């Protein structure tokens, strides 16, 4: 029940250090609080791990980098909560500013391991309409049916290898479509947990 982004398992570039399960472990990021009025959140893929653990070391010390990912969202709501999230993975997520101050601040183009809340969920902060974001790989989190969503996204870039810090490959977006409503007397903030695990990772050019 895991969506395969464009239907290609991530593969090593045939012929550069190939790390091991010491790096290819499950990084469980912090949990964000899905409230009623909350608009959503997004993470830049390679940027979200550039400062945590051995993967952060490899990214911040090598020169070329390529890796797949097995992003995994789960949210633990009760059976009396109602709502619906849209989680998709957007290649080349180019965040754009919103002029009435013409380019996005760095805190909005690379939010880090904490994510950024959307300013314009309707237009995805990038002018494109949300109603069409489903053209990307996605999975629906509808509380009455399922509460998990796994996306396997391979390496999509023009060049074979690229810098892990200058250019972020894609961006994981999770937006509430049907807002979270609940009667009085429940946990007023469903928690959303995002587990990431690199796949078929590679580096080159140490120090």
């Amino acid at each position: 029940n895991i969506v395969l982004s464009y239907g290609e398992w991530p593969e090593y570039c045939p012929s550069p250090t190939r790390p091991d399960v010491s790096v290819n472990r499950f990084y469980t990021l912090s949990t964000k609080s899905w409230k009623t009025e909350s608009t959503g959140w997004y993470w830049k893929f390679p940027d979200v791990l550039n400062d945590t653990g051995v993967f952060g070391q490899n990214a911040q010390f090598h020169y070329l980098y390529r890796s797949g990912f097995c992003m995994h969202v789960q949210c633990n709501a009760s059976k009396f909560h109602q709502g619906a999230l849209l989680v998709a993975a957007i290649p080349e997520f180019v965040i754009a500013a919103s002029s009435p101050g013409l380019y996005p601040d760095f805190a909005h183009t690379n939010p880090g391991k904490d994510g950024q809340e959307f300013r314009d969920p309707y237009v995805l902060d990038a002018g494109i309409p949300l109603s069409q974001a489903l053209i990307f790989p996605h999975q629906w989190i509808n509380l009455r049916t399922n509460n998990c969503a796994t996306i396997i996204m391979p390496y999509i870039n023009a060049l074979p290898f690229d810098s892990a810090l200058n250019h972020s490959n894609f961006g994981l977006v999770v937006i509430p479509i049907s807002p979270l409503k609940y009667c009085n007397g429940a946990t007023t903030e469903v928690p959303i947990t995002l587990t990431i695990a690199p796949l078929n990772s590679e580096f080159s050019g140490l120090r």
């Binding site: 009396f80 109602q82 489903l134 479509i177 049907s178 409503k181 009667c183 009085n184």
Partner: protein
């Protein structure tokens, strides 16, 4: 058209207002012709 066939039944302490989401698409037999410019 979408019609309320029955009422909306919930046990106590449960929201009484939901949302239906409609998704559109085209089957495999869809075809186009005579490309032209758009109207934004």
């Amino acid at each position: 058209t979408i019609w309320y066939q029955t009422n909306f039944v919930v046990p106590p302490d449960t929201p009484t207002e939901a949302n239906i989401i409609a998704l559109g698409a085209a089957q495999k037999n869809f075809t186009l012709k005579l490309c032209k410019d758009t109207d934004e």
